[PDB]
């Protein structure tokens, strides 16, 4: 057809093939790594979730009980990294 | 009263001109840790932590890549001491990712459908004018 | 033997619940013909 | 003590079947591939205080879910009844070796962590911290009571006495 | 250490701001313990030095003979003076296996 | 038993106006509101300003009574169960008391699993004889007003601190001085005293 | 029918963009989105043996030589790798496009030549011995499909301008234009005789065009229907039977259409394909059809 | 004209004449819209598609942003293509998607910016609120009183 419509069809094929065959969309693309969080996040989560007697966090009351079956393992790593009397 | 350092060597050269503000940001973080949740939702009470962490990291990032006001040594001291985030900076140096909130808001393992948050969608491609508050972060449009 | 080994594996999966805890991303598509066609119901289509 | 430690070395060396090459499992790599886990970096004393609070919360959530409101788990992991119990309440609240063994593991970890906490508060010393940890790992059978809920730990406990005679 | 009815202390206010203490950390001679003194009491001592270990996985170490000499005379209190294993003639592993296979004990050995 | 089925049984005014739908499948997420045996929960977003609906009852409790799993209305006509049973017969007689309900559920599920898995098990022969008055009040266009977020209970007390970011509606709740506002789940399911019906 | 009823060829992790029959026809090699090319012996038990890696893109176009000794395929990263059928080693790689290579063809008979087309709007002629482009033909719109005539004089290119273009190797000029498609052309293929070229397009119609010294001048020789394209915008390729009697072309409706060469009548329309079909190929001796699709599986239909 | 209507999974390679000829005879009158449609499990026919992720989510977000999309049906009324949605805005905006540079560019909203991270209790990088739209939404002048009435009517029940 007209030159403007062919230009529009070319532009909306170039953008499509650009975003559809991007290098972050290949077959064995292992996506990015989970990174370190600010240390205050877990601190305020433990501070707000107190003795678990607040009503607001009652939906997490189930989850904590399940975490009981990993409390031996969480003990082991805790004592595996004890800091060595020459360390402060 | 200040942050206990873990280097025990003296801090580098230009330390004394960035310390009032770092301690003022550090005093600001200790406010947000101790705020009681009352009229703050369960996810909303963690939003100030990510905002102040963004701010501290942005401050060192501005003094080293924009203003050139700090050497490599003082820069890498602030990263080691926890004033700035090494991984958040490495994303800000990428091409599209330059006002990113969090590392949660680009993590695709954290979402149901394996995607970023709507935080990261350009406001021109929402085309509707809807208001956004990211649940991870509180952000309204990084990208 | 192929039919019985599958049920064997499904019974044996209970014995160790999480040693190398599970992994899941076969996110898939299904093409569905609603079978209660209306002019305005899907929006405008036979399938979804 | 030296003779018993020699016997332990010989029993280690004798019944050594080779490592039996398996498929590697990586529990913590499968936890942080999920959306329910994040990762940070923290002081060891802070994580130890966290682990003690979490285990305390787990054990008394197990108590409060079984409606056992007449029991009390104190902060040093002693389980005591609040009142005098009936026969039915005593038959109901009898725990097994799992609950008590996990409770005593948490008691030992809280002994270690509170030693580090009274170090980091500036209350004790560094040398007295070392001697306190040495007493903790030499006297588990006198400071915890783990032996009552699993008796085979005497194999460990005697061995620690042997090391205390060795050193 | 803490009483039974005492709630556990919060890290963020009781411990977070306190300077910890002096550690134990023996004073090293700056001339005699020279190739060791800069790094000997760090956590993972020579970790970010590519000449002595690889990377941050901290898996393979490569030291120099002055370093091994200094680490050897720092550790004399925990080591032995036995140059050859002829000391362990009847007192080694296979001898004790022969003793367990029979009813024999060794006068300084296991029963 | 469990249920463990793929792709729920949905109508078209609950499944949304988008032909392109994302839903999540949770394996044994909730229990049935009727059967109380746990099933596979499917959860999607219907449209843009909608509510994130999810399936409420089992595949089995929709096979027995020919309804959608979330709105509990007919698949073919789209009317309440008491209306469709009024325009037909009522010979199911599912038990409402506890042990009889689970016994009948086990046996009818055995009858389902001893068949193909495609038809209404008892409603088919009475579903041949149709086209009563119920065809003359069936809704032609989708009623997308169900798929709509709840009244903000902080805004009713005048304390909605989210304001414009709150996804819940800032509009009138319905007057409780109304027969149309009681509406139990089980009353709508078993065809007993449904005021809409 | 030779030992083939239907079978099933699997192994692929992504859509199978192309597959061609061994010049001999005894063996086969396929490749697609998986950046892997698969060779499965057609006869006996149909099992692959040699895999050819070395592609940082989608092995979009896959081809064979008249002999079939040398196989060359075109990837999406703007680089074409040339691999011999025997020993499977990247033997001659030619890199001259600034964008994705959409397709490639190898000249039969005459001294070795290779043509490529890409999203940069250019068409390039390669001599496998030079490690450099011989000629470059700037179009202006993205080029999707390219083939040589049997005389090795002309290059036939299909783009997104709905117009098949013919290039003269000596003049380096736009010799011919073909009108007749309403939308982008996705796949071109010459008859074994040189006589006719088969085209698929987004205009909903399979068109045969005749290329001859003496041409009617309006070369819409025949039109066939049934082949559907949709929102996936997959490149669609079509093939001639060994004797030129049958025409196969893949579709996005998972149906393997095969019309009659002389009467333009749908001879076959086989199913058994879950996802859109990307290429259909004919065995050179026997009536065997290899269908490749986005469902990552192959079938060996026997007629 | 040669093969059974539906059993499934033919072992030989069929012909177009031997599988797709229509069934002879009249339809039975003993089936409804649900029973006459080739349904798979009580509500329609569900089969595993293999649509590209990008194109699917492109059309999905195009509908969710505007209100139109292409048709993902296999054949439908036989025809190469058509659009499904609010069809009037498809040909208006030439059928663009979200992933493409738009035609319309006007009326952008205004918000704060203090991107410096130097002024404490003044920084808001990407947490910047709009200047026009505002927080807590107290309802109206009569909405409050009628909500007080409806809560009072709730109080007369329990
Ligand atoms: Zn964020
Ligand atoms: Zn976000
Ligand atoms: Zn953001
Ligand atoms: Zn049910
Ligand atoms: Zn419904
Ligand atoms: Zn609200």
User: How many whole angstroms separate alpha carbon E12 and alpha carbon G7?
Assistant: 68
Q: Which of residues 8-37 of A touch G (CB under 8 A)?
A: 9-10, 13-14, 16-17, 21, 26-27
Block residue for tokens 């787990």: D58
Judge if F105 and F157 occupy the same domain: no
Ligand nearest to the backbone CA of B142: 3
Q: Which residues of B touch E18 (CB under 8 A)?
A: 4
Judge if F144 and F180 occupy the same domain: no
* Tally of domains in chain F: 2
Residue E82 makes CB contacts below 8 A (sequence gap 6+) with: none
Contact F165 B133 (CB under 8 A): yes
Residue F94 makes CB contacts below 8 A (sequence gap 6+) with: F64, F65, F101, F104, F190
List subunits contacting chain G, requiring 3 or more Cβ pairs under 8 Å: A, H
Judge if F111 and F154 occupy the same domain: no
DSSP annotation of H26 reads: P
Flag whether residue B42 sits within 8 Å of chain F, measured between CB atoms: no
Domains, chain G, ordered by start? 1-303 (2.130.10.10)
Q: Which residues of F touch H32 (CB under 8 A)?
A: 76, 127, 130
Q: Which residues of F touch H (CB under 8 A)?
A: 6-7, 9-11, 18-20, 22, 47-48, 62-63, 66, 68, 75-76, 117-120, 127-128, 130, 155-156, 158-164, 166, 170, 172-173, 175-177
In chain D, count H helices and then E strands. Answer: 8, 2
Q: Which residues of E touch B3 (CB under 8 A)?
A: 17
Block residue for tokens 């000029």: G173
Exposure on the CB side of residue G186, measured as CA atoms within 13 A: 29
Q: Which of residues 96-125 of B touch F (CB under 8 A)?
A: 112-113
Q: Compare all CA atoms of chain F with the CA of C47 and give the residue at the minimum distance.
A: F19
H29-38 contacts at long range (C-beta below 8 A, 24 or more positions apart): H30/F128, H31/F128, H32/F76, H32/F127, H32/F130, H33/C35, H33/C36, H33/C37, H33/F76, H34/C35, H34/C36, H34/F75, H34/F76, H35/F127, H37/C33, H37/C35, H37/C37, H38/C33
Determination approach: cryo-EM
What token pair was written down for E54?
Answer: 């690889």
What token pair was written down for G68?
Answer: 């079939």
What token pair was written down for D75?
Answer: 């902060």
Neighbours of ion ligand 2 (CB under 5 A): B 105, 117, 119, 134, 136-137, 139
Chain A: nearest CA to B33, how far in angstroms? 6
User: How many whole angstroms separate alpha carbon F151 and alpha carbon A76?
Assistant: 49
Contact F118 H30 (CB under 8 A): no
Judge if F82 and F176 occupy the same domain: no
Judge if F33 and F121 occupy the same domain: yes
Contact B2 E17 (CB under 8 A): yes
Residue D91 makes CB contacts below 8 A (sequence gap 6+) with: none
What token pair was written down for A47?
Answer: 């501070």
Residue E104 makes CB contacts below 8 A (sequence gap 6+) with: E98
Residue F17 domain boundaries: 1-148+185-197
User: How many whole angstroms separate alpha carbon A12 and alpha carbon B107?
Assistant: 29
How far is the centre of ligand 1, averaged over its atoms, from the C-alpha of B47 (Å)? 8
Contact H39 F158 (CB under 8 A): no
The H-assigned helical ranges of F36-163 are 60-63, 81-86, 98-113, 125-128
* DSSP-assigned beta bridge partners for residue F63: none
The H-assigned helical ranges of D15-153 are 27-31, 44-65, 87-92, 97-120, 127-138, 140-143
User: How many whole angstroms separate alpha carbon B101 and alpha carbon H125?
Assistant: 9
CB G59, CB G73: distance < 8 Å: yes
**Residue of A36, A39, A42, A87 best to disrupt the E interface, most CBs of E under 10 A:** A87
The sign of the torsion formed by the CA atoms of F179, F185, F190, F191 equals positive
What token pair was written down for C3?
Answer: 């039919």
User: How many whole angstroms separate alpha carbon D76 and alpha carbon D138?
Assistant: 19
Maximum Cα–Cα distance for chain G, whole Å? 50
The helix (run of H) or strand (run of E) holding residue F26 is strand F23-26
Contact F161 B39 (CB under 8 A): yes
CB G229, CB G255: distance < 8 Å: no
The H-assigned helical ranges of chain E are 11-14, 65-74, 93-101
Flag whether residue G266 sits within 8 Å of chain H, measured between CB atoms: yes
CB F7, CB H41: distance < 8 Å: yes
Judge if F113 and F36 occupy the same domain: yes
CB B6, CB A83: distance < 8 Å: no
Q: Compare all CA atoms of chain H with the CA of G293 and give the residue at the minimum distance.
A: H50
In chain G, count H helices and then E strands. Answer: 0, 28
List subunits contacting chain D, requiring 3 or more Cβ pairs under 8 Å: A, B, C, E
Contact G268 H70 (CB under 8 A): no
Contact B106 A43 (CB under 8 A): no
Residue H127 sits at the vertex; the CA angle it makes with H123 and H128, to the nearest 5 degrees, is 80
Residue F108 sits at the vertex; the CA angle it makes with F103 and F113, to the nearest 5 degrees, is 125
Resolution to one decimal, Å: 2.9
């Amino acid at each position: 057809m007209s030159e403007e419509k062919l230009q529009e069809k070319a532009r909306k094929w170039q953008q499509l093939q650009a975003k559809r065959y991007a290098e972050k969309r290949k077959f064995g693309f292992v996506d990015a790594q989970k990174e370190d969080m600010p240390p205050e996040h877990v601190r305020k989560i433990i501070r707000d979730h107190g003795d678990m007697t607040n009503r607001k966090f009652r939906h997490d009351k189930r989850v904590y009980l399940g975490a009981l079956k990993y409390m031996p393992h969480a003990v082991l790593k805790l004592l595996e990294n004890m800091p060595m009397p020459w360390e402060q | 009263m200040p942050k206990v350092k873990r280097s025990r060597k003296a801090p580098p050269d230009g330390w004394e001109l960035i310390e009032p503000t770092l301690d003022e940001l550090d005093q600001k973080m200790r406010e947000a840790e101790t705020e009681p949740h009352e009229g703050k939702r369960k996810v909303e009470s963690l939003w100030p932590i990510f905002r102040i962490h963004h701010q501290k990291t942005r401050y060192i990032f501005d003094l080293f890549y924009k203003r050139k006001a700090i050497s490599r040594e003082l820069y890498e001291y602030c990263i080691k001491e926890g004033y700035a985030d090494k991984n958040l900076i490495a994303k800000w140096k990428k091409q599209g990712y330059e006002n990113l909130c969090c590392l949660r808001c680009i993590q695709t393992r954290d979402t149901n459908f394996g995607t970023n948050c709507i935080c990261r969608v350009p406001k021109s491609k929402l085309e509707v004018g809807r208001i956004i508050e990211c649940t991870h972060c509180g952000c309204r449009g990084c990208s | 033997r192929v039919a019985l080994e599958k049920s064997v594996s499904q019974k044996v999966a209970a014995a160790m619940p999480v040693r190398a805890a599970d992994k899941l991303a076969p996110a898939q598509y299904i093409r569905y013909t609603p079978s209660q066609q209306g002019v305005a119901f899907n929006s405008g289509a036979k399938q979804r | 003590s030296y003779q018993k430690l020699l016997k332990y070395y010989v029993l280690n060396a004798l019944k050594h079947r080779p490592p039996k090459a398996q498929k590697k499992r990586y529990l913590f790599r499968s936890f942080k591939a999920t959306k329910f886990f994040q990762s940070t970096k923290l002081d060891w004393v802070e994580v130890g205080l966290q682990v003690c609070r979490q285990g305390y919360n787990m054990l008394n959530l197990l108590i409060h879910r079984k409606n056992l409101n007449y029991l009390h788990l104190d902060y040093n992991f002693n389980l005591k009844p609040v009142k005098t119990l009936t026969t039915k309440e005593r038959k109901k609240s009898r725990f097994g070796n799992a609950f008590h063994l996990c409770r005593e593991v948490l008691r030992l970890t809280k002994l270690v962590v509170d030693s580090h906490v009274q170090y980091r508060l500036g209350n004790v010393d560094a040398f007295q911290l070392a001697d306190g940890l040495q007493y903790i790992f030499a006297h588990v059978g006198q400071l915890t009571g783990m032996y009552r809920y699993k008796y085979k730990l005497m194999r460990q406990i005697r061995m620690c006495k042997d090391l205390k005679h060795l050193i | 250490p803490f009483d039974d009815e005492e709630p556990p202390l919060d890290y963020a206010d009781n411990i977070l701001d306190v300077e910890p203490l002096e550690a134990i950390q023996l004073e090293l001679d700056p001339e005699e313990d020279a190739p060791v003194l800069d790094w000997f009491y760090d956590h993972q001592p020579l970790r970010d030095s590519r000449k002595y270990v690889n990377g941050s996985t901290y898996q393979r170490w490569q030291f120099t003979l002055p370093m091994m000499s200094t680490l050897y005379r720092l550790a004399n209190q925990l080591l032995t003076d036995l140059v050859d294993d002829n000391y362990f003639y009847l007192f080694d592993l296979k001898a004790f296996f022969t003793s367990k296979a029979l009813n024999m004990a060794i006068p300084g050995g296991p029963k | 038993n469990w249920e463990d089925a793929d792709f729920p049984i949905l109508c078209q005014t609950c499944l949304g106006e988008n032909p392109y739908i994302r839903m999540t499948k949770e394996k044994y997420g909730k229990e049935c509101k009727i059967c109380a045996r746990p099933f596979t929960v499917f959860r999607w977003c219907p449209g843009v300003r909608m509510r994130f609906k999810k399936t409420e009852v089992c595949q089995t409790c929709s096979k027995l009574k020919n309804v959608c799993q979330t709105c509990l209305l007919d698949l073919e006509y789209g009317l309440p169960i008491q209306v469709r049973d009024a325009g037909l017969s009522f010979k199911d007689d599912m038990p409402k008391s506890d042990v009889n309900k689970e016994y009948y559920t086990q046996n009818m599920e055995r009858e389902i699993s001893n068949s193909d898995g495609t038809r209404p098990v008892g409603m088919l022969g009475k579903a041949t004889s149709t086209s009563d008055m119920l065809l003359k009040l069936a809704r032609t266009t989708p009623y997308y007003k169900r798929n709509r977020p709840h009244i903000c209970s902080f805004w009713v007390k005048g304390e909605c601190k989210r304001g414009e970011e709150c996804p819940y509606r800032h509009e009138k709740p319905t007057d409780p001085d109304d027969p149309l506002a009681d509406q139990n789940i089980k009353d709508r399911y078993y065809g007993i005293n449904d005021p809409v019906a | 029918s030779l030992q083939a009823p239907i079978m099933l060829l699997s192994g692929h992790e992504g859509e199978v963009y192309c597959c061609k029959f061994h010049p001999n026809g005894s063996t086969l090699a396929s490749a697609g989105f998986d950046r892997l090319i698969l060779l499965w012996n057609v006869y006996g038990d149909c099992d692959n043996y040699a895999t050819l890696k070395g592609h940082s893109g989608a092995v979009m176009e896959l081809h064979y030589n008249t002999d079939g000794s040398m196989l060359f395929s075109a990837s999406t990263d703007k680089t074409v790798a040339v691999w011999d059928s025997e020993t499977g080693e990247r033997v001659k790689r030619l890199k001259g496009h600034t964008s994705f290579v959409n397709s490639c063809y190898p000249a039969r008979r005459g001294p070795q030549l290779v043509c490529t087309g890409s999203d940069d709007g250019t068409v390039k002629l390669w001599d496998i011995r030079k490690k450099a482009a011989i000629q470059t033909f700037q179009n202006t719109y993205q080029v999707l499909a390219v083939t040589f005539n049997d005389t090795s004089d002309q290059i036939i290119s299909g783009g997104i301008d709905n117009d098949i273009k013919v290039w003269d190797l000596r003049q380096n000029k736009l010799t011919y234009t073909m009108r007749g498609h309403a939308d982008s052309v996705t796949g071109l293929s010459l008859s074994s005789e040189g006589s006719y070229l088969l085209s698929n397009a987004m205009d909903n119609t399979v068109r045969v065009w005749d290329v001859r010294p003496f041409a009617p001048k309006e070369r819409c020789v025949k039109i066939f229907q049934g082949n559907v394209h949709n929102f996936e915008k997959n490149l669609l390729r079509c093939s001639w039977s060994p004797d030129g009697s049958k025409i196969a072309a893949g579709s996005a409706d998972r149906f393997v259409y095969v019309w009659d060469t002389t009467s333009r009548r749908i001879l076959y329309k086989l199913p058994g394909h879950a996802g859109s079909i990307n290429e259909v190929a004919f065995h050179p001796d026997e009536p065997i059809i290899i269908s490749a699709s986005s469902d990552k599986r192959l079938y060996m239909g026997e007629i | 004209v040669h093969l059974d209507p539906a059993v499934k999974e033919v072992q030989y390679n069929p012909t177009y004449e031997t599988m797709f000829a229509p069934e002879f005879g009249p339809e039975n009158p003993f089936r409804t819209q649900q029973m006459a449609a080739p349904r798979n499990m009580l509500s329609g026919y569900a089969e595993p598609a293999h649509i590209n992720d990008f194109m699917f989510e492109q059309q999905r977000r195009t509908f969710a942003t505007y209100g139109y999309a292409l048709d993902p049906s296999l054949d439908n009324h036989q025809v190469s293509a058509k659009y499904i949605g609010s069809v009037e805005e498809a040909e208006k905006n030439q059928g663009l998607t979200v992933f493409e540079t738009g035609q319309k560019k006007t009326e952008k909203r205004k918000k704060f910016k203090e991107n410096d991270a130097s002024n404490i209790d003044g920084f808001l990088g990407p947490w910047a609120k709009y200047v026009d739209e505002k927080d807590v939404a107290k309802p109206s002048e009569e909405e409050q009183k009628e909500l007080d009435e409806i809560t009072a009517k709730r109080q007369k029940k329990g």
